[PDB]
């Protein structure tokens, strides 16, 4: 179909004995201008003459009592729908680029084994495994501090927990705030020091680290990542000129939140390069035809049948040794024979895993992945400079701009942990809004990110909440939505097909440790 045209809209919003107002015609005129736009592309179709909504919302704020309001309100609904027809019927090929991120430490072999599976089936794709060459010791310095944060916590605790994690975060913040002052100072005296220089100096002075054996970890980390596809380094001239950089350095150096710096990187790299981002815990999709002859038992969850598939493929083909048969080893030999026979009747990796190939997506969209708890950015697809990718970056940029207008005042007062939290909570409660009510609540937990349970701030800043907020800005014809009011059935429009990714891997299945009440006093017993 299409959208309603000028004659049609004239029928809907007609009121007998009521002439056409100056602004009512502005809507009819722009709508007619729209349907004479076949020579134009998708992007400037979406705005140049597909706002309309603007000229419509103008009519409803001038003539608040007009009869046509009820009809034009439905007209705005047909505009959201036409945007989805635009997204689904005009698709261009996607850049054959695959993006991974490993920053802060040495890449371990399990991550390389998962990446090598994408290269073998998709031999027509560039593989970039982004790393920060200047910050290999950010994971090393994070461990050292919390290690020492417990030695000093238990030193003054001669008689529980809760009070443990409470009085531990106070120490971590002081050792954190101490390092940030050393960094901001070292960078002033010597602008030529990189992050790694400052960290091995701080780790050697205040923690007696064999710095002889530290510059070895740096040499091995680069030698490893550089011969495994690499295609990266702290390069990116367009990422460093962009406003999103000192946001990434803030989560990296001032915060030691390795993942939150990756959340900022992935969406910016997709917008500037194009391609498809994946966490290193993801595996290529399985050929949909492979195990159709092995009926799944009706007394078994769907997730179980999904992991057992990958575990079987890794048992009789051994692409990845040391992959657990943990879930496969619980079927009778009547069923394990069904897998071994099917894994015999294939002889190539691309007979088992589906390749991506010539993918295509819309210039407006950024395709996001799904699980049981909503959208998740363990897999993203976007064409270069897609309209959604720009909205997600402005959304994350806008959300951090809010975070720092209230947090940086309290950091500058250099008090302890609790006086700084009280100053920071009032500042978000001051410049608070009725729109961002759901947002500013999760913001108060920001200092505890990485060191406590029940902290959902990272999600509301540069995670799923920001992506959905960008999808709303797309579908509501606005920018800067803070309160999500899109239903789940709406967001599945930007879903990534289950046959392009394999999520139930051993790895991202092994990163579901709850760390809450189901822990109960434990882990402290480890500390001996």
């Amino acid at each position, epitope marked *: 179909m299409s959208l309603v045209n000028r004659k049609q809209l004239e029928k809907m919003a007609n009121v007998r004995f009521r002439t056409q107002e100056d602004e009512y015609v502005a809507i009819l005129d722009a709508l007619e201008e729209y349907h004479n736009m076949s020579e134009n592309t998708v992007v400037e179709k979406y705005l140049k003459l597909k706002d309309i909504n603007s000229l419509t919302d103008i009519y409803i704020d001038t003539y608040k009592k007009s009869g046509r309001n009820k009809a034009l309100k439905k007209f705005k609904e047909y505009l959201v729908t036409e945007v989805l027809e635009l997204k689904n019927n005009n698709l261009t*090929p996607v850049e054959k680029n695959l993006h991974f991120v490993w920053i802060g430490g040495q890449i371990n072999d399990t991550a390389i084994n998962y990446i090598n599976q994408w290269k073998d089936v998709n031999s*027509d794709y560039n593989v970039n495994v982004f790393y920060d060459s200047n910050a290999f010791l950010i994971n090393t310095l994070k461990k050292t501090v919390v290690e020492s944060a417990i030695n000093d916590t238990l030193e003054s605790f001669r008689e529980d927990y809760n009070k443990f994690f409470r009085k531990r975060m106070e120490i971590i913040y002081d050792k954190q705030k101490n390092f940030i002052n050393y960094y901001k100072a070292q960078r002033e005296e010597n602008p030529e020091l990189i992050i790694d220089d400052i960290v091995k100096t701080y780790l050697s002075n205040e923690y007696s680290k064999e710095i002889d054996e530290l510059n070895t970890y740096i040499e091995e980390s680069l030698n490893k990542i550089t011969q495994n596809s690499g295609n*990266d380094v702290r*390069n990116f001239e367009e990422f460093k000129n962009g406003e999103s950089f000192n946001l990434y350095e803030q989560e990296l150096v001032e915060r030691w939140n390795l993942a939150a710096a990756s959340d900022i990187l992935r969406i910016s790299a997709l917008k500037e390069i194009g391609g498809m981002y994946l966490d290193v815990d993801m595996l290529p999709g399985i050929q949909p035809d492979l195990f159709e002859s092995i009926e799944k038992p009706s007394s078994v969850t769907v997730d179980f049948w999904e992991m057992t598939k990958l575990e079987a493929i890794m048992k009789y083909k051994e692409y990845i040794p040391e992959y657990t048969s943990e879930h496969f080893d619980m079927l009778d030999e009547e069923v394990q024979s069904s897998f071994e026979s099917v894994l015999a009747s294939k002889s190539d990796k*691309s007979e088992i895993f589906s*390749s991506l190939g010539d993918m295509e997506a819309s210039p407006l969209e950024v395709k996001i992945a799904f699980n049981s708890k909503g959208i998740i950015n363990q897999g993203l697809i976007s064409v270069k400079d897609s309209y959604c990718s720009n909205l997600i970056v402005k959304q994350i940029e806008n959300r951090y701009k809010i975070l720092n207008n209230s947090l940086n005042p309290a950091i500058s007062e250099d008090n302890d942990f609790n006086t700084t939290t009280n100053t920071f909570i009032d500042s978000i409660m001051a410049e608070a809004n009725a729109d961002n009510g759901r947002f500013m609540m999760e913001l108060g937990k920001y200092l505890r990110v990485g060191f406590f349970p029940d902290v959902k701030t990272t999600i509301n800043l540069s995670g799923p909440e920001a992506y959905a907020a960008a999808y709303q800005d797309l579908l509501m014809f606005k920018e800067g939505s803070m309160n999500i009011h899109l239903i789940e059935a709406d967001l599945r429009n930007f879903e990534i097909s289950k046959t392009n990714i394999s999520q139930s891997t051993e790895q991202e299945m092994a990163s579901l440790w709850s760390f809450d009440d189901a822990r109960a006093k434990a882990q402290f017993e480890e500390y001996k």
Partner: antibody
Amino acid sequence: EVQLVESGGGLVQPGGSLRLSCAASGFTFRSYWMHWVRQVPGKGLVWVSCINKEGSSTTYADSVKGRFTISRDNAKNTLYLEMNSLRADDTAVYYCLRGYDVDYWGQGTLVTVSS
Amino acid sequence: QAVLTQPSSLSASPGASVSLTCTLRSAINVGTYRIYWYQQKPGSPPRYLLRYKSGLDKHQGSGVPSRFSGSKDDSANAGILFISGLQSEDEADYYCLIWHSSAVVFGGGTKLTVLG
């Protein structure tokens, strides 16, 4: 191991017709676009026609517009090119190649148009 | 000129390093496209080689030696094909690609003669 083997080329009267057939193996014959490219023996490469993944839209070169038709059968993993109203210009070797950003080439079948 | 233009032919001695250019006329065209390189050793069909569009949007065909590399020299709008460590097994014809107003356009071809 991706292999593409075309056939159907031979010798035709100027004005006759031919049906070239590139058969695909080793990869998912869907998932990818396809092209036809001709090379007059002893000269450069020249593009002819290109078909979608699904065969919904197609683009032809200005030389063969109207005279040529590209066709794609995703079942029988095979591509087609139907050449009508043949000139002597069309005498060349015709290759089929794979992907939007184009990767792998075929053997090439020779087509001669002489009287 | 002609959308996308290459030199006729060039020769060099084994071991030397060469750079082929695929220039493309000025105007509605710059260096924000991909450059697809191809090698056709005579008597055989072409071989995929490289794809370079940017430092992060580059590719080398499976089996292409690491001595082949591509970049783009600005100010001249041209794409480049460095071949360092030349050998007699590299004597062939070389073509580039570009996606234009839809369709896809080739270059003239460079008859590289490695005299060994």
